[PDB]
Amino acid sequence: KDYRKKYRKYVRSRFQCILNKRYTRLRLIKEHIKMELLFDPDEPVHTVVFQGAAGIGKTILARKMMLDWASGTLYQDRFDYLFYIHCREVSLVTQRSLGDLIMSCCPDPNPPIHKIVRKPSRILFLMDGFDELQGAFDEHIGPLCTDWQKAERGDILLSSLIRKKLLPEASLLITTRPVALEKLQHLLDHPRHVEILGFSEAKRKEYFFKYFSDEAQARAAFSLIQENEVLFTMCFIPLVCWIVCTGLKQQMESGKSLAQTSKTTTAVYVFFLSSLLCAHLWGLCSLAADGIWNQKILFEESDLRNHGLQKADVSAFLRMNLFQKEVKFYSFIHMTFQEFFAAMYYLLEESRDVTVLLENYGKFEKGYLIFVVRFLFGLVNQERSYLEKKLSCKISQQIRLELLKWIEVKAKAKKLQIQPSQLELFYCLYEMQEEDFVQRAMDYFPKIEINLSTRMDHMVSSFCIENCHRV
Ligand SMILES: CN[C@@H]1COc2c(S(=O)(=O)NC(=O)Nc3c4c(cc5c3CCC5)CCC4)cnn2C1
Ligand SMILES: Nc1ncnc2c1ncn2[C@@H]1O[C@H](COP(=O)(O)OP(=O)(O)O)[C@@H](O)[C@H]1O
Numbered sequence: 001k002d003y004r005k006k007y008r009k010y011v012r013s014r015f016q017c018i019l020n021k022r023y024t025r026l027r028l029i030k031e032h033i034k035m036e037l038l039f040d041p042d043e044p045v046h047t048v049v050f051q052g053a054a055g056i057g058k059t060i061l062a063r064k065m066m067l068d069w070a071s072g073t074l075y076q077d078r079f080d081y082l083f084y085i086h087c088r089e090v091s092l093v094t095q096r097s098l099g100d101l102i103m104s105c106c107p108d109p110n111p112p113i114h115k116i117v118r119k120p121s122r123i124l125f126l127m128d129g130f131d132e133l134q135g136a137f138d139e140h141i142g143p144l145c146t147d148w149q150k151a152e153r154g155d156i157l158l159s160s161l162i163r164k165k166l167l168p169e170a171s172l173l174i175t176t177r178p179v180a181l182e183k184l185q186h187l188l189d190h191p192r193h194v195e196i197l198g199f200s201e202a203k204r205k206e207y208f209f210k211y212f213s214d215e216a217q218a219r220a221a222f223s224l225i226q227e228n229e230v231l232f233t234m235c236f237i238p239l240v241c242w243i244v245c246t247g248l249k250q251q252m253e254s255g256k257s258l259a260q261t262s263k264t265t266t267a268v269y270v271f272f273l274s275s276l277l278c279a280h281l282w283g284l285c286s287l288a289a290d291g292i293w294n295q296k297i298l299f300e301e302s303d304l305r306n307h308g309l310q311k312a313d314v315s316a317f318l319r320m321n322l323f324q325k326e327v328k329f330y331s332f333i334h335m336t337f338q339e340f341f342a343a344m345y346y347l348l349e350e351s352r353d354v355t356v357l358l359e360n361y362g363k364f365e366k367g368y369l370i371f372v373v374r375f376l377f378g379l380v381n382q383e384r385s386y387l388e389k390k391l392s393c394k395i396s397q398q399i400r401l402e403l404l405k406w407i408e409v410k411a412k413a414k415k416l417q418i419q420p421s422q423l424e425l426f427y428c429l430y431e432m433q434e435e436d437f438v439q440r441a442m443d444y445f446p447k448i449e450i451n452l453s454t455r456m457d458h459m460v461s462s463f464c465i466e467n468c469h470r471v
């Protein structure tokens with residue numbers, strides 16, 4: 001078992017940072033709890049899927065579980081190997097074997113894979129970010145592989161592993177956004193489903209106090225945040241807390257008095273961009289658009305140079321908080337920022353037509369284009385800064401009109417998880433505060449049905465309904 005201890009030590013080394021102290025627990029609701037009882041029966045479950053909103057903390061949950069297992073505190077008598085598969089890195093088109101996939105996660109270049117697969121009952125895989133798989137993923141592609149040694153396409157390998165036909169006795173855990181279940185239904189095998197909820201108000205304050213190392217700064221920041229309620233109730237998503245606290249730190253550097261007027265998600269992201277920030281921006285948005293359309297999330301130095309980085313602007317300027325270097329490869333800190341920049345790509349004047357963008361919306365192959373549409377809804381409103389002089393004005397009109405038409409076609413129907421749901425058609429309107437546009441769009445709802453499960457849910461529904469009287 002010497003290699004077992006070596007792998008545990010290497011994993012401890014990798015997942016030590018994010019640090020452990022920074023972790024703030026999030027809620028969970030099984031049956032959709034005890035973290036050590038997830039894989040026990042109440043026969044035994046072999047697949048458990050964690051569903052949650054983007055930015056809710058799926059990846060950090062996976063990394064914390066990794067660290068806990070490495071420390072020997074969690075599943076200490078259940079699993080012997082805990083292989084972290086980052087779905088962002090895995091490529092569907094490329095031909096690879098499961099042995100090579102396992103080797104890609106090990107410390108040394110000579111893993112006893114043959115020894116490892118002797119006891120598959122003590123092996124668990126962590127497919128973190130299923131919606132992040134790039135390219136087209138056929139639901140019924142085959143034939144499904146059987147043995148790890150053999151090499152097949154990424155699609156076949158991933159699907160066969162998911163269908164519990166490759167290493168049948170191995171345990172699996174996939175962390176997916178709920179939008180992607182439409183394609184994950186056909187593959188799952190008697191799955192268990194768990195949900196990540198968000199940050200409670202008490203845990204919101206806890207995070208705000210752990211962010212800072214001095215009492216005065218944390219107290220002032222919390223006081224400023226609480227005094228406005230929309231941002232505070234939208235702060236149950238940890239990524240919003242991260243953005244707001246990082247911006248607060250940036251403002252606190254200088255003597256300027258703190259301030260946060262952000263009312264919507266688009267406003268939050270725009271405030272972040274302004275706080276942390278021409279030739280620099282157009283390439284920054286072209287990179288995001290190309291990555292979204294061409295199914296590229298990680299970009300090589302050559303790719304960065306192609307768009308306009310000009311051998312610079314990323315060593316210091318953009319990497320400050322936007323980009324992140326991984327393993328030559330520079331990605332975006334969070335996919336939401338990439339989608340924000342892709343949406344901005346449609347609203348810069350020196351810009352592909354939005355009609356083709358909307359035509360393929362909610363598709364798994366194209367990345368579901370969800371945050372892109374929401375962010376271009378938010379960014380186009382005329383009511384909403386040095387940046388507003390940059391985004392194109394005339395084109396807005398055209399896209400505005402097209403958006404309206406989209407609404408007209410998407411309300412004469414019903415949908416629950418196929419993506420343009422009534423609630424999601426409303427979230428998009430909420431991002432566009434303009435009263436006139438919201439009224440005209442709401443004019444296309446002869447009947448309304450909505451399922452409400454959070455407080456932001458209730459706020460958005462109430463805002464849409466208030467203008468929905470139809471006069
Ligand atoms: C009725 N559909 C609503 C559609 O959305 C959403 C998701 S998600 O996968 O779309 N994720 C998000 O929408 N995340 C999100 C983010 C920010 C701010 C807000 C949300 C949702 C509440 C407000 C900033 C970072 C990501 C999950 N449930 N719902 C609710
Ligand atoms: N427990 C936590 N403590 C501190 N920050 C968190 C926590 N959970 C999530 N976050 C923040 O929320 C953001 C969500 O990103 P991440 O969880 O890595 O990916 P995903 O959005 O797929 O879950 C992160 O940038 C992180 O800073």
Ligand SMILES: [Mg+2]
Nearest residue numbers: 058059128129
């Ligand atoms: Mg993630």
